């Protein structure tokens, strides 16, 4: 642990184009394993990992028919929110939802959660008690009053505690080897000089999975977080990720600096230093 089963839902109104677009995307430990998209040729739930091809036809039909029902609900919710904010029907708006559960190595429920957002702003969220809600604005207080008097939080609690956990538990067993997943980074340091008294040292990390990683530059012990520059982790487009961090140093002082790569797949953190051929 901690293992997670999250479902990411998007609903976007598209006036003067067509019907609203709808997407559900399931994740297992932040790994896309299922997906539904209304703008596909024939909208159905499809596997996004090859370990999901185990599941039978009754599973896919059930999940597919469920998604179409969900689409219609969010179709109504989009028109409801126009009313709450008194907004025009000829403008595009986006409803997003993340709904999932997390379990530890033992299997116990650590955190269950469900939270909504309208036009990229928090709308309403289920508290960690799985009993009460938290409205983000006056519009969301209308929804808060409904679901509390409707006793909706309790019905969600059943799904999150029971169903979500039990199915998450099932997926982990079907994709244990695939989700055990680790590619160690290939790392190196490039030198980028300039007509100036300084040079740029750039530490690379390539071909690694999962995307969780930390690169640091150090000067004789201490880490140079402030003067460091780094890019956000990025997909290579083949299942692996890339990242680099860099530092500007005085000319002729390259051997004073040390790059460090921290990653799961490594037996121990890599320690890199600028070295020419020459």
């Amino acid at each position: 642990g901690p293992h997670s089963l999250r479902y990411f839902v998007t609903a976007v109104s598209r006036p003067g184009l067509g019907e609203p677009r709808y997407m559900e995307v399931g994740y297992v430990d932040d790994t896309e394993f299922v997906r539904f998209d209304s703008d596909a040729e024939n909208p159905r739930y499809e596997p996004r990992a090859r370990w999901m091809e185990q599941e039978g036809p009754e599973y896919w039909e059930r999940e597919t028919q469920k998604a179409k029902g969900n689409e219609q609900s969010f179709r109504v919710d989009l028109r409801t929110l126009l009313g709450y904010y008194n907004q025009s029907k000829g403008g595009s708006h986006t409803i997003q939802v993340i709904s999932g559960c997390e379990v530890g190595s033992d299997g116990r429920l650590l955190r269950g959660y469900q939270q909504y957002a309208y036009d990229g702003c928090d709308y309403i969220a289920l508290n960690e008690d799985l009993k009460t809600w938290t409205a983000a604005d006056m519009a969301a207080l209308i929804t808060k009053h409904k679901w509390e008097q409707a006793g909706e939080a309790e019905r969600l609690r059943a799904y999150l505690e029971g169903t979500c956990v039990e199915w998450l538990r099932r997926y982990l067993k079907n994709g244990n080897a695939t989700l055990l997943r680790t590619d160690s980074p290939k790392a190196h340091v490039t030198h980028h000089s300039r007509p100036e008294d300084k040079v740029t040292l750039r530490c690379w990390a390539l071909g690694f999975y999962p995307a969780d990683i930390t690169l640091t530059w150090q000067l004789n012990g201490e880490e140079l977080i402030q003067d460091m520059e780094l890019v956000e982790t990025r997909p290579a487009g083949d299942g692996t990720f890339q990242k680099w961090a860099s530092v500007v140093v005085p000319l002729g002082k390259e051997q004073y600096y040390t790059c460090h790569v921290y990653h799961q797949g490594l037996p121990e953190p890599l320690t890199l230093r600028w070295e020419p051929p020459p």
Binding site: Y7, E24, G26, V34, F36, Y45, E63, K66, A67, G69, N70, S73, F74, V76, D77, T80, L81, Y84, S99, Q114, Y116, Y123, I124, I142, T143, K146, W147, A150, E152, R155, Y159, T163, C164, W167
Partner: peptide
């Protein structure tokens, strides 16, 4: 197993 029967806002 995605959530079914989403409550209306």
């Amino acid at each position: 197993f995605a959530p079914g029967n989403w409550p209306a806002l």
